[PDB]
């Protein structure tokens, strides 16, 4: 049995035109959507969501194709796993709950969905927080030897199918665990709750889920990059008030200032898994910003 790490929260399967979105839902007050990244699921918010739920209705969603959300059929341009499409699908999900204007925080891939959502449909967001990321365009522009070695996933997982799928299927438990440990300050799994790690391992064990992650990275190399490049070339900035947080061992505020007209930010001592490695600091920063 996978553990229930959100005591008090409901479990909802929310319909959209592209498939169901699974979410844990707790609290009352203004609506706040939380979006996880790779290689994780909604459970990564389990240490910060309760504190947010003291003041907000918190909706903790599995991204399209991740976790227990349905996996829409992809295509040659990876369309359903582009951040523009995932944002449209999560906008539909929020409309099923009657939420057309909400607060949003995302981490890693979910943060990519979130800033794309803010660029495409800023009217949907009261405030936005992004965790542990720079825009996809900035990672690719920075691409050099040092980055190619650090963020090798961006080129490896984007290789044409079935290359990464075939490699990942030999020992997916090792890969997911080694990858998680490698992004933390500690270099091991000690910053994660073992019950959460089990959620991540079980999702990663499904070849269909791993294919989705590769489609996500293929979109990140191609259409998501092109979408971002258009905004850079147009001089488009996010007008939604926003917060950028990042683990120092994972400036970023200088970068976000080029992408957003009202942005505040701060490093926190942590690797790339802020809500699990530094939950108190992360929750405090998010509560203060969204309140």
Ligand X SMILES: *[C@H](Cc1ccc(C(F)(F)F)cc1)C(=O)O
Residue 192 DSSP one-character state: S
Which of 28, 174, 236, 248 is the binder for its own copies (CB under 8 A)?
A: 174
- Beta-carbon-side half-sphere exposure of residue 73 (alpha carbons within 13 Å): 1
Is residue 288 classed exposed, middle or buried when 0-12, 13-18 and 19+ CB atoms within 10 A define those classes? exposed
C-alpha of 43 from chain center: 12
The structure tokens listed for 58 are 């918190």
Report the nearest approach of its own copies to the CB of residue 28 (Å).
Answer: 44
Picked from ligand X, its own copies, none, the partner binding residue 158 (CB below 5 to 8 A depending on kind) is its own copies
Do residues 88 and 38 touch, judged by C-beta distance below 8 A? no
Alpha helices in 235-278 (DSSP H): 252-257, 274-277
Alpha-carbon separation of residue 270 from 21, 49, 160 (angstroms): 30, 18, 33
Q: Which residue is nearest to ligand X (CB)?
A: 183
Strands 10-14, 263-268: pairing kind: unpaired
Does 109 engage in binding with ligand X (CB under 6 A)? yes
Picked from ligand X, its own copies, none, the partner binding residue 259 (CB below 5 to 8 A depending on kind) is none
Residues within window 81-140 making contact with its own copies, judged by CB under 8 A: 140
Do residues 106 and 130 touch, judged by C-beta distance below 8 A? yes
Does 182 engage in binding with ligand X (CB under 6 A)? yes
Which of 9, 38, 115, 259 is the binder for ligand X (CB under 6 A)?
A: 38
The structure tokens listed for 5 are 């790490």
The structure tokens listed for 25 are 């839902």
Which of 19, 26, 31, 39 is the binder for ligand X (CB under 6 A)?
A: 39
Does 259 engage in binding with ligand X (CB under 6 A)? no
Report the nearest approach of ligand X to the CB of residue 71 (Å).
Answer: 19
Picked from its own copies, ligand X, none, the partner binding residue 108 (CB below 5 to 8 A depending on kind) is ligand X
Report the nearest approach of ligand X to the CB of residue 225 (Å).
Answer: 12
Is residue 251 classed exposed, middle or buried when 0-12, 13-18 and 19+ CB atoms within 10 A define those classes? exposed
Residues within window 189-228 making contact with its own copies, judged by CB under 8 A: 221, 225
Do residues 132 and 273 touch, judged by C-beta distance below 8 A? yes
Does 49 engage in binding with ligand X (CB under 6 A)? no
Does 154 engage in binding with its own copies (CB under 8 A)? yes
Does 37 engage in binding with ligand X (CB under 6 A)? yes
Picked from its own copies, ligand X, none, the partner binding residue 141 (CB below 5 to 8 A depending on kind) is its own copies
CA atoms of 78 and 220, how far apart (whole Å): 9
Which of 149, 194, 233, 234 is the binder for its own copies (CB under 8 A)?
A: 149
CA atoms of 49 and 59, how far apart (whole Å): 9
Picked from ligand X, its own copies, none, the partner binding residue 234 (CB below 5 to 8 A depending on kind) is none
List interacting residues with its own copies (CB under 8 A): 140-141, 143-145, 147-149, 152, 154-156, 158-159, 163, 166-171, 174-175, 178, 221, 225
List interacting residues with ligand X (CB under 6 A): 37-39, 108-109, 112, 133, 153, 179-180, 182-183, 272
């Amino acid at each position: 049995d996978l553990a229930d790490l959100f005591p008090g929260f409901g479990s909802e399967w929310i319909n959209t035109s592209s498939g169901r979105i699974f979410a844990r839902v707790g609290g009352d007050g203004p609506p706040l959507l939380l979006l996880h990244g790779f290689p994780q699921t909604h459970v990564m918010w389990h240490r910060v969501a309760p504190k947010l739920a003291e003041r907000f209705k918190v909706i903790v969603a599995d991204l399209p194709g991740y976790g227990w959300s349905d996996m829409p059929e992809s295509d040659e341009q990876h369309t359903p796993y582009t951040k523009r499409a995932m944002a449209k699908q999560l906008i539909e999900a929020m409309e099923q709950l009657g939420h057309v204007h909400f607060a949003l925080a995302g981490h890693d891939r979910g943060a990519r969905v979130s800033y794309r959502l803010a660029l495409d449909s800023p009217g949907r967001l009261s405030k936005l927080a992004v965790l542990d990321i720079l825009p996809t365009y900035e990672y690719w522009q920075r691409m050099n030897r040092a980055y190619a070695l650090k963020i090798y996933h961006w080129s490896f997982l984007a290789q044409p199918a079935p290359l990464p799928e075939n490699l990942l299927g030999g020992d997916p438990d090792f890969y997911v665990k080694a990858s998680l440990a490698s992004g933390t300050r500690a270099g091991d799994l000690s910053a994660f709750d073992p019950r959460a790690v089990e959620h991540y391992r079980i999702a990663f064990a499904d070849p269909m889920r791993r294919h989705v992650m590769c489609e996500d990275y293929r979109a990140g190399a191609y259409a998501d990059f092109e979408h971002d490049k258009i905004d850079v070339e147009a001089g488009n900035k996010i007008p939604v008030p926003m917060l950028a947080l990042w683990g120092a061992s994972g400036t970023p505020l200088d970068v976000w200032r080029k992408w957003a007209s009202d942005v505040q930010g701060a490093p926190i001592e942590s690797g790339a898994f802020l809500p699990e490695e530094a939950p108190d600091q992360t929750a405090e920063a998010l509560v203060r910003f969204f309140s």
